[PDB]
């Protein structure tokens, strides 16, 4: 909608040319300021409008976060408005196995971005949550790829690729995808399932995350976590008031946009 407002939300000061380094800087500052959160789907408020207006009004004006379709929706509109070429991809999240588990639904979405003189297409994903990649990744298999955090890698699979992160001296598989361009309608169908089906983790529990220079912050219900170089510091928070303070104070979420903060704790206790 209005870049000025998106730039002053995430406080972006830099070039606006469709270059690689602008792509890297936008990703870092985006990740840093707009959290992952599923507070809408949790409280019975689906996500099925993925238009620039809708996504700008929530993540920018209202100072809220959002999940993958909202994040990578908003990033996608921003990169297109700047002169990047944006193709939206669908993905199935297989992180943490099991193989005994059925195939996940395609309820993740990321971006494949090109720009002038680009060396090809770059993967961009600011919507995977705490472990989302923090640097654009050249879309090539095998090659180990440095990021501002851990290094990432893509590997071939039958008709697709898989995205891997180096977490604790283990390559860990995050999700699997194809580079088939997905139209808005199909992302709407997926997000509708993600934010309304009663077995979806985004309807059944609280997940938040935000990323900093030296850490990845994750909240899963009342259990906070910060992944740093020296490992992970965990804490189980006391009451509903502790979790609501954590979202406001440490994830930066405008919880007042969800009604009286004293009226939201009640929902969380459940």
PDB file of C-alpha atoms in Angstrom:
ATOM      1  CA  UNK A   1       0.000   0.000   0.000  1.00  0.00           C
ATOM      2  CA  UNK A   2       2.286   2.765   1.353  1.00  0.00           C
ATOM      3  CA  UNK A   3       5.990   1.988   1.659  1.00  0.00           C
ATOM      4  CA  UNK A   4       6.767   5.041   3.789  1.00  0.00           C
ATOM      5  CA  UNK A   5       4.650   3.539   6.537  1.00  0.00           C
ATOM      6  CA  UNK A   6       6.164   0.096   6.252  1.00  0.00           C
ATOM      7  CA  UNK A   7       9.652   1.572   6.333  1.00  0.00           C
ATOM      8  CA  UNK A   8       8.894   3.639   9.448  1.00  0.00           C
ATOM      9  CA  UNK A   9       7.290   0.600  11.128  1.00  0.00           C
ATOM     10  CA  UNK A  10      10.445  -1.455  10.786  1.00  0.00           C
ATOM     11  CA  UNK A  11      12.518   1.769  10.841  1.00  0.00           C
ATOM     12  CA  UNK A  12      14.241   1.111   7.549  1.00  0.00           C
ATOM     13  CA  UNK A  13      16.797   3.671   6.499  1.00  0.00           C
ATOM     14  CA  UNK A  14      18.747   2.558   3.450  1.00  0.00           C
ATOM     15  CA  UNK A  15      18.676   2.401  -0.348  1.00  0.00           C
ATOM     16  CA  UNK A  16      15.390   1.373  -2.033  1.00  0.00           C
ATOM     17  CA  UNK A  17      16.863   0.039  -5.257  1.00  0.00           C
ATOM     18  CA  UNK A  18      16.161  -3.602  -6.180  1.00  0.00           C
ATOM     19  CA  UNK A  19      19.651  -4.819  -5.270  1.00  0.00           C
ATOM     20  CA  UNK A  20      20.785  -7.861  -3.231  1.00  0.00           C
ATOM     21  CA  UNK A  21      21.898  -5.765  -0.230  1.00  0.00           C
ATOM     22  CA  UNK A  22      18.653  -3.959   0.055  1.00  0.00           C
ATOM     23  CA  UNK A  23      17.088  -7.430  -0.002  1.00  0.00           C
ATOM     24  CA  UNK A  24      19.378  -8.544   2.830  1.00  0.00           C
ATOM     25  CA  UNK A  25      18.755  -5.375   4.937  1.00  0.00           C
ATOM     26  CA  UNK A  26      15.013  -5.460   4.571  1.00  0.00           C
ATOM     27  CA  UNK A  27      14.884  -9.066   5.669  1.00  0.00           C
ATOM     28  CA  UNK A  28      17.029  -8.377   8.787  1.00  0.00           C
ATOM     29  CA  UNK A  29      15.025  -5.343   9.949  1.00  0.00           C
ATOM     30  CA  UNK A  30      11.655  -6.958   9.068  1.00  0.00           C
ATOM     31  CA  UNK A  31      12.569 -10.072  11.070  1.00  0.00           C
ATOM     32  CA  UNK A  32      13.693  -7.895  13.917  1.00  0.00           C
ATOM     33  CA  UNK A  33      10.544  -5.845  14.349  1.00  0.00           C
ATOM     34  CA  UNK A  34       7.466  -7.658  12.990  1.00  0.00           C
ATOM     35  CA  UNK A  35       6.983 -10.814  15.066  1.00  0.00           C
ATOM     36  CA  UNK A  36       5.522 -14.139  14.129  1.00  0.00           C
ATOM     37  CA  UNK A  37       2.298 -14.576  16.097  1.00  0.00           C
ATOM     38  CA  UNK A  38      -1.004 -16.466  15.539  1.00  0.00           C
ATOM     39  CA  UNK A  39      -3.145 -14.528  17.944  1.00  0.00           C
ATOM     40  CA  UNK A  40      -5.882 -13.984  15.347  1.00  0.00           C
ATOM     41  CA  UNK A  41      -6.363 -17.636  14.377  1.00  0.00           C
ATOM     42  CA  UNK A  42      -6.089 -18.650  18.080  1.00  0.00           C
ATOM     43  CA  UNK A  43      -8.973 -16.325  19.095  1.00  0.00           C
ATOM     44  CA  UNK A  44     -11.211 -17.406  16.203  1.00  0.00           C
ATOM     45  CA  UNK A  45     -10.305 -14.704  13.718  1.00  0.00           C
ATOM     46  CA  UNK A  46      -9.296 -16.420  10.465  1.00  0.00           C
ATOM     47  CA  UNK A  47      -6.669 -15.239   8.011  1.00  0.00           C
ATOM     48  CA  UNK A  48      -8.234 -15.286   4.574  1.00  0.00           C
ATOM     49  CA  UNK A  49      -7.605 -11.768   3.219  1.00  0.00           C
ATOM     50  CA  UNK A  50      -4.049 -11.686   1.815  1.00  0.00           C
ATOM     51  CA  UNK A  51      -4.424  -8.384  -0.033  1.00  0.00           C
ATOM     52  CA  UNK A  52      -1.868  -5.602   0.438  1.00  0.00           C
ATOM     53  CA  UNK A  53      -4.391  -3.441   2.154  1.00  0.00           C
ATOM     54  CA  UNK A  54      -5.405  -6.096   4.601  1.00  0.00           C
ATOM     55  CA  UNK A  55      -1.888  -7.144   5.425  1.00  0.00           C
ATOM     56  CA  UNK A  56      -0.610  -3.551   5.672  1.00  0.00           C
ATOM     57  CA  UNK A  57      -3.400  -2.521   7.987  1.00  0.00           C
ATOM     58  CA  UNK A  58      -2.603  -5.331  10.412  1.00  0.00           C
ATOM     59  CA  UNK A  59       1.180  -5.703  10.349  1.00  0.00           C
ATOM     60  CA  UNK A  60       1.950  -2.026   9.762  1.00  0.00           C
ATOM     61  CA  UNK A  61      -0.729   0.307  10.999  1.00  0.00           C
ATOM     62  CA  UNK A  62      -2.002  -1.799  13.819  1.00  0.00           C
ATOM     63  CA  UNK A  63       1.465  -2.829  15.005  1.00  0.00           C
ATOM     64  CA  UNK A  64       0.613  -6.549  14.989  1.00  0.00           C
ATOM     65  CA  UNK A  65       2.509  -9.567  13.793  1.00  0.00           C
ATOM     66  CA  UNK A  66       1.167 -12.403  11.684  1.00  0.00           C
ATOM     67  CA  UNK A  67       2.057 -15.912  10.463  1.00  0.00           C
ATOM     68  CA  UNK A  68       3.596 -17.122   7.107  1.00  0.00           C
ATOM     69  CA  UNK A  69       0.941 -15.886   4.627  1.00  0.00           C
ATOM     70  CA  UNK A  70       0.831 -12.514   6.268  1.00  0.00           C
ATOM     71  CA  UNK A  71       4.583 -12.129   6.617  1.00  0.00           C
ATOM     72  CA  UNK A  72       5.508 -13.449   3.222  1.00  0.00           C
ATOM     73  CA  UNK A  73       2.426 -11.779   1.792  1.00  0.00           C
ATOM     74  CA  UNK A  74       3.591  -8.379   3.071  1.00  0.00           C
ATOM     75  CA  UNK A  75       7.211  -8.882   2.155  1.00  0.00           C
ATOM     76  CA  UNK A  76       6.120 -10.005  -1.366  1.00  0.00           C
ATOM     77  CA  UNK A  77       4.129  -6.826  -1.964  1.00  0.00           C
ATOM     78  CA  UNK A  78       7.012  -4.720  -0.666  1.00  0.00           C
ATOM     79  CA  UNK A  79       9.588  -6.331  -3.003  1.00  0.00           C
ATOM     80  CA  UNK A  80       7.293  -6.056  -5.990  1.00  0.00           C
ATOM     81  CA  UNK A  81       6.636  -2.346  -5.310  1.00  0.00           C
ATOM     82  CA  UNK A  82      10.382  -1.772  -5.319  1.00  0.00           C
ATOM     83  CA  UNK A  83      11.042  -3.502  -8.639  1.00  0.00           C
ATOM     84  CA  UNK A  84      11.829  -7.090  -7.563  1.00  0.00           C
ATOM     85  CA  UNK A  85      10.203 -10.013  -9.387  1.00  0.00           C
ATOM     86  CA  UNK A  86       8.247 -12.049  -6.855  1.00  0.00           C
ATOM     87  CA  UNK A  87       6.955 -15.609  -7.365  1.00  0.00           C
ATOM     88  CA  UNK A  88       5.094 -17.090  -4.392  1.00  0.00           C
ATOM     89  CA  UNK A  89       5.762 -20.777  -3.479  1.00  0.00           C
ATOM     90  CA  UNK A  90       3.901 -23.334  -1.334  1.00  0.00           C
ATOM     91  CA  UNK A  91       5.625 -25.648   1.166  1.00  0.00           C
ATOM     92  CA  UNK A  92       5.030 -28.533   3.595  1.00  0.00           C
ATOM     93  CA  UNK A  93       6.655 -28.227   6.993  1.00  0.00           C
ATOM     94  CA  UNK A  94       8.441 -31.444   7.967  1.00  0.00           C
ATOM     95  CA  UNK A  95      10.608 -30.021  10.791  1.00  0.00           C
ATOM     96  CA  UNK A  96      11.322 -32.411  13.633  1.00  0.00           C
ATOM     97  CA  UNK A  97      10.008 -35.444  11.726  1.00  0.00           C
ATOM     98  CA  UNK A  98       8.490 -38.092  12.481  1.00  0.00           C
ATOM     99  CA  UNK A  99       8.585 -40.112   9.224  1.00  0.00           C
ATOM    100  CA  UNK A 100       5.883 -42.282  10.838  1.00  0.00           C
ATOM    101  CA  UNK A 101       3.753 -39.113  10.475  1.00  0.00           C
ATOM    102  CA  UNK A 102       1.584 -38.417   7.435  1.00  0.00           C
ATOM    103  CA  UNK A 103       2.553 -35.829   4.847  1.00  0.00           C
ATOM    104  CA  UNK A 104       1.822 -32.330   6.020  1.00  0.00           C
ATOM    105  CA  UNK A 105      -0.613 -30.036   4.162  1.00  0.00           C
ATOM    106  CA  UNK A 106       0.883 -27.278   2.010  1.00  0.00           C
ATOM    107  CA  UNK A 107       0.304 -24.629   4.627  1.00  0.00           C
ATOM    108  CA  UNK A 108       3.635 -22.886   4.383  1.00  0.00           C
ATOM    109  CA  UNK A 109       4.506 -20.246   1.795  1.00  0.00           C
ATOM    110  CA  UNK A 110       7.793 -18.586   0.911  1.00  0.00           C
ATOM    111  CA  UNK A 111       9.098 -16.398  -2.020  1.00  0.00           C
ATOM    112  CA  UNK A 112      11.389 -16.782  -5.002  1.00  0.00           C
ATOM    113  CA  UNK A 113      12.822 -13.364  -5.848  1.00  0.00           C
ATOM    114  CA  UNK A 114      14.826 -12.003  -8.793  1.00  0.00           C
ATOM    115  CA  UNK A 115      16.127  -8.478  -9.441  1.00  0.00           C
ATOM    116  CA  UNK A 116      18.380  -6.737 -12.003  1.00  0.00           C
ATOM    117  CA  UNK A 117      21.596  -8.567 -12.641  1.00  0.00           C
ATOM    118  CA  UNK A 118      20.626 -11.110 -10.018  1.00  0.00           C
ATOM    119  CA  UNK A 119      22.668 -14.233 -10.228  1.00  0.00           C
ATOM    120  CA  UNK A 120      19.410 -16.107 -10.609  1.00  0.00           C
ATOM    121  CA  UNK A 121      16.486 -16.513  -8.188  1.00  0.00           C
ATOM    122  CA  UNK A 122      16.851 -15.997  -4.419  1.00  0.00           C
ATOM    123  CA  UNK A 123      14.741 -17.626  -1.799  1.00  0.00           C
ATOM    124  CA  UNK A 124      13.195 -15.223   0.741  1.00  0.00           C
ATOM    125  CA  UNK A 125      11.248 -16.397   3.834  1.00  0.00           C
ATOM    126  CA  UNK A 126      10.396 -14.106   6.786  1.00  0.00           C
ATOM    127  CA  UNK A 127       7.426 -16.250   7.797  1.00  0.00           C
ATOM    128  CA  UNK A 128       8.729 -19.538   9.114  1.00  0.00           C
ATOM    129  CA  UNK A 129       8.867 -18.295  12.734  1.00  0.00           C
ATOM    130  CA  UNK A 130      11.852 -18.549  15.046  1.00  0.00           C
ATOM    131  CA  UNK A 131      13.966 -20.583  12.599  1.00  0.00           C
ATOM    132  CA  UNK A 132      13.134 -18.664   9.472  1.00  0.00           C
ATOM    133  CA  UNK A 133      16.253 -17.809   7.368  1.00  0.00           C
ATOM    134  CA  UNK A 134      17.803 -14.398   8.073  1.00  0.00           C
ATOM    135  CA  UNK A 135      19.621 -13.832   4.725  1.00  0.00           C
ATOM    136  CA  UNK A 136      18.466 -14.233   1.164  1.00  0.00           C
ATOM    137  CA  UNK A 137      19.485 -17.655  -0.095  1.00  0.00           C
ATOM    138  CA  UNK A 138      20.679 -18.367  -3.633  1.00  0.00           C
ATOM    139  CA  UNK A 139      18.461 -21.148  -4.951  1.00  0.00           C
ATOM    140  CA  UNK A 140      21.083 -23.821  -5.647  1.00  0.00           C
ATOM    141  CA  UNK A 141      21.466 -27.248  -4.139  1.00  0.00           C
ATOM    142  CA  UNK A 142      24.286 -28.634  -2.009  1.00  0.00           C
ATOM    143  CA  UNK A 143      26.231 -25.427  -1.588  1.00  0.00           C
ATOM    144  CA  UNK A 144      26.459 -24.540   2.068  1.00  0.00           C
ATOM    145  CA  UNK A 145      25.134 -21.019   2.429  1.00  0.00           C
ATOM    146  CA  UNK A 146      26.212 -18.529   5.121  1.00  0.00           C
ATOM    147  CA  UNK A 147      23.570 -16.313   6.707  1.00  0.00           C
ATOM    148  CA  UNK A 148      23.727 -13.643   9.386  1.00  0.00           C
ATOM    149  CA  UNK A 149      22.812 -16.501  11.796  1.00  0.00           C
ATOM    150  CA  UNK A 150      23.383 -20.248  11.171  1.00  0.00           C
ATOM    151  CA  UNK A 151      24.205 -21.416   7.653  1.00  0.00           C
ATOM    152  CA  UNK A 152      21.491 -22.893   5.450  1.00  0.00           C
ATOM    153  CA  UNK A 153      21.408 -25.305   2.588  1.00  0.00           C
ATOM    154  CA  UNK A 154      18.991 -26.541  -0.139  1.00  0.00           C
ATOM    155  CA  UNK A 155      19.049 -30.168  -1.264  1.00  0.00           C
ATOM    156  CA  UNK A 156      17.320 -31.912  -4.140  1.00  0.00           C
ATOM    157  CA  UNK A 157      14.346 -34.196  -3.618  1.00  0.00           C
ATOM    158  CA  UNK A 158      12.006 -35.866  -6.190  1.00  0.00           C
ATOM    159  CA  UNK A 159      10.647 -32.909  -8.185  1.00  0.00           C
ATOM    160  CA  UNK A 160      11.422 -30.509  -5.350  1.00  0.00           C
ATOM    161  CA  UNK A 161      14.016 -29.104  -2.999  1.00  0.00           C
ATOM    162  CA  UNK A 162      14.298 -29.076   0.809  1.00  0.00           C
ATOM    163  CA  UNK A 163      15.457 -26.227   2.956  1.00  0.00           C
ATOM    164  CA  UNK A 164      17.956 -27.135   5.724  1.00  0.00           C
ATOM    165  CA  UNK A 165      19.406 -25.190   8.671  1.00  0.00           C
ATOM    166  CA  UNK A 166      22.597 -26.025  10.581  1.00  0.00           C
ATOM    167  CA  UNK A 167      21.291 -26.170  14.159  1.00  0.00           C
ATOM    168  CA  UNK A 168      23.601 -27.741  16.773  1.00  0.00           C
ATOM    169  CA  UNK A 169      26.081 -29.384  14.438  1.00  0.00           C
ATOM    170  CA  UNK A 170      23.201 -31.118  12.702  1.00  0.00           C
ATOM    171  CA  UNK A 171      21.613 -30.193   9.401  1.00  0.00           C
ATOM    172  CA  UNK A 172      17.881 -29.919  10.272  1.00  0.00           C
ATOM    173  CA  UNK A 173      15.167 -30.108   7.606  1.00  0.00           C
ATOM    174  CA  UNK A 174      12.655 -27.294   7.887  1.00  0.00           C
ATOM    175  CA  UNK A 175      10.337 -27.766   4.941  1.00  0.00           C
ATOM    176  CA  UNK A 176       9.948 -29.094   1.422  1.00  0.00           C
ATOM    177  CA  UNK A 177       8.714 -27.160  -1.646  1.00  0.00           C
ATOM    178  CA  UNK A 178       8.497 -26.916  -5.418  1.00  0.00           C
ATOM    179  CA  UNK A 179       9.109 -23.786  -7.466  1.00  0.00           C
ATOM    180  CA  UNK A 180       5.638 -23.828  -8.905  1.00  0.00           C
ATOM    181  CA  UNK A 181       4.177 -20.342  -8.774  1.00  0.00           C
ATOM    182  CA  UNK A 182       1.042 -20.392  -6.570  1.00  0.00           C
ATOM    183  CA  UNK A 183      -1.794 -17.996  -7.366  1.00  0.00           C
ATOM    184  CA  UNK A 184      -3.385 -15.888  -4.636  1.00  0.00           C
ATOM    185  CA  UNK A 185      -6.456 -18.069  -4.491  1.00  0.00           C
ATOM    186  CA  UNK A 186      -4.534 -21.208  -3.555  1.00  0.00           C
ATOM    187  CA  UNK A 187      -2.653 -19.425  -0.748  1.00  0.00           C
ATOM    188  CA  UNK A 188      -6.062 -18.237   0.492  1.00  0.00           C
ATOM    189  CA  UNK A 189      -7.283 -21.869   0.533  1.00  0.00           C
ATOM    190  CA  UNK A 190      -4.214 -22.952   2.510  1.00  0.00           C
ATOM    191  CA  UNK A 191      -4.345 -20.080   4.954  1.00  0.00           C
ATOM    192  CA  UNK A 192      -8.067 -20.734   5.484  1.00  0.00           C
ATOM    193  CA  UNK A 193      -7.204 -24.277   6.476  1.00  0.00           C
ATOM    194  CA  UNK A 194      -4.253 -23.046   8.616  1.00  0.00           C
ATOM    195  CA  UNK A 195      -6.355 -20.500  10.536  1.00  0.00           C
ATOM    196  CA  UNK A 196      -9.693 -22.384  10.800  1.00  0.00           C
ATOM    197  CA  UNK A 197      -9.270 -26.200  10.867  1.00  0.00           C
ATOM    198  CA  UNK A 198      -9.652 -27.378  14.509  1.00  0.00           C
ATOM    199  CA  UNK A 199      -6.595 -29.617  14.342  1.00  0.00           C
ATOM    200  CA  UNK A 200      -4.243 -26.848  13.193  1.00  0.00           C
ATOM    201  CA  UNK A 201      -1.536 -25.869  15.659  1.00  0.00           C
ATOM    202  CA  UNK A 202      -2.368 -22.195  14.920  1.00  0.00           C
ATOM    203  CA  UNK A 203      -5.893 -22.708  16.194  1.00  0.00           C
ATOM    204  CA  UNK A 204      -4.926 -25.054  19.066  1.00  0.00           C
ATOM    205  CA  UNK A 205      -1.963 -23.256  20.627  1.00  0.00           C
ATOM    206  CA  UNK A 206       0.035 -20.060  20.952  1.00  0.00           C
ATOM    207  CA  UNK A 207       3.191 -19.680  18.861  1.00  0.00           C
ATOM    208  CA  UNK A 208       5.225 -16.425  18.678  1.00  0.00           C
ATOM    209  CA  UNK A 209       8.729 -15.500  17.496  1.00  0.00           C
ATOM    210  CA  UNK A 210      11.068 -12.586  16.725  1.00  0.00           C
ATOM    211  CA  UNK A 211      14.712 -12.555  15.658  1.00  0.00           C
ATOM    212  CA  UNK A 212      17.580 -10.433  16.913  1.00  0.00           C
ATOM    213  CA  UNK A 213      21.216  -9.882  16.031  1.00  0.00           C
ATOM    214  CA  UNK A 214      22.441 -12.613  18.386  1.00  0.00           C
ATOM    215  CA  UNK A 215      19.303 -14.635  19.174  1.00  0.00           C
ATOM    216  CA  UNK A 216      16.142 -16.402  17.965  1.00  0.00           C
ATOM    217  CA  UNK A 217      13.177 -15.888  20.385  1.00  0.00           C
ATOM    218  CA  UNK A 218      10.395 -18.507  20.481  1.00  0.00           C
ATOM    219  CA  UNK A 219       7.251 -18.748  22.597  1.00  0.00           C
ATOM    220  CA  UNK A 220       5.094 -21.883  22.548  1.00  0.00           C
ATOM    221  CA  UNK A 221       2.194 -21.512  24.912  1.00  0.00           C
ATOM    222  CA  UNK A 222       3.683 -20.377  28.241  1.00  0.00           C
ATOM    223  CA  UNK A 223       7.164 -21.639  27.447  1.00  0.00           C
ATOM    224  CA  UNK A 224       9.588 -18.973  26.391  1.00  0.00           C
ATOM    225  CA  UNK A 225      12.889 -19.667  24.708  1.00  0.00           C
ATOM    226  CA  UNK A 226      15.922 -17.826  23.365  1.00  0.00           C
ATOM    227  CA  UNK A 227      18.302 -19.651  21.061  1.00  0.00           C
ATOM    228  CA  UNK A 228      21.762 -18.061  21.149  1.00  0.00           C
ATOM    229  CA  UNK A 229      25.296 -19.220  20.395  1.00  0.00           C
ATOM    230  CA  UNK A 230      25.717 -20.659  23.889  1.00  0.00           C
ATOM    231  CA  UNK A 231      22.560 -22.713  23.501  1.00  0.00           C
ATOM    232  CA  UNK A 232      19.004 -22.205  24.580  1.00  0.00           C
ATOM    233  CA  UNK A 233      17.626 -20.561  27.677  1.00  0.00           C
ATOM    234  CA  UNK A 234      14.168 -21.779  28.623  1.00  0.00           C
ATOM    235  CA  UNK A 235      11.549 -20.632  31.060  1.00  0.00           C
ATOM    236  CA  UNK A 236       7.964 -21.623  31.770  1.00  0.00           C
ATOM    237  CA  UNK A 237       5.964 -18.456  32.504  1.00  0.00           C
ATOM    238  CA  UNK A 238       3.833 -18.055  35.593  1.00  0.00           C
ATOM    239  CA  UNK A 239       0.269 -16.957  34.735  1.00  0.00           C
ATOM    240  CA  UNK A 240      -1.727 -15.563  31.812  1.00  0.00           C
ATOM    241  CA  UNK A 241      -0.536 -12.076  32.731  1.00  0.00           C
ATOM    242  CA  UNK A 242       3.109 -13.184  32.243  1.00  0.00           C
ATOM    243  CA  UNK A 243       2.429 -14.447  28.741  1.00  0.00           C
ATOM    244  CA  UNK A 244       0.546 -11.264  27.729  1.00  0.00           C
ATOM    245  CA  UNK A 245       3.401  -9.134  29.123  1.00  0.00           C
ATOM    246  CA  UNK A 246       5.909 -11.228  27.143  1.00  0.00           C
ATOM    247  CA  UNK A 247       4.044 -10.715  23.845  1.00  0.00           C
ATOM    248  CA  UNK A 248       3.764  -6.964  24.447  1.00  0.00           C
ATOM    249  CA  UNK A 249       7.201  -6.351  26.007  1.00  0.00           C
ATOM    250  CA  UNK A 250       9.493  -8.955  24.369  1.00  0.00           C
ATOM    251  CA  UNK A 251       7.642  -9.622  21.115  1.00  0.00           C
ATOM    252  CA  UNK A 252       6.413  -6.064  20.748  1.00  0.00           C
ATOM    253  CA  UNK A 253       2.865  -7.048  19.822  1.00  0.00           C
ATOM    254  CA  UNK A 254       0.197  -4.363  20.123  1.00  0.00           C
ATOM    255  CA  UNK A 255      -1.992  -6.512  22.337  1.00  0.00           C
ATOM    256  CA  UNK A 256      -4.378  -3.620  22.889  1.00  0.00           C
ATOM    257  CA  UNK A 257      -5.497  -4.118  19.297  1.00  0.00           C
ATOM    258  CA  UNK A 258      -7.035  -7.383  20.532  1.00  0.00           C
ATOM    259  CA  UNK A 259      -9.312  -5.514  22.978  1.00  0.00           C
ATOM    260  CA  UNK A 260      -8.574  -4.691  26.641  1.00  0.00           C
ATOM    261  CA  UNK A 261      -5.344  -6.419  27.675  1.00  0.00           C
ATOM    262  CA  UNK A 262      -7.104  -7.265  30.958  1.00  0.00           C
ATOM    263  CA  UNK A 263      -9.798  -8.954  28.882  1.00  0.00           C
ATOM    264  CA  UNK A 264      -7.297 -10.941  26.794  1.00  0.00           C
ATOM    265  CA  UNK A 265      -5.496 -12.685  29.662  1.00  0.00           C
ATOM    266  CA  UNK A 266      -8.793 -14.542  30.294  1.00  0.00           C
ATOM    267  CA  UNK A 267      -8.771 -16.167  26.917  1.00  0.00           C
ATOM    268  CA  UNK A 268      -5.144 -17.249  27.266  1.00  0.00           C
ATOM    269  CA  UNK A 269      -5.575 -18.893  30.657  1.00  0.00           C
ATOM    270  CA  UNK A 270      -7.556 -21.307  28.468  1.00  0.00           C
TER     271      UNK A 270
END
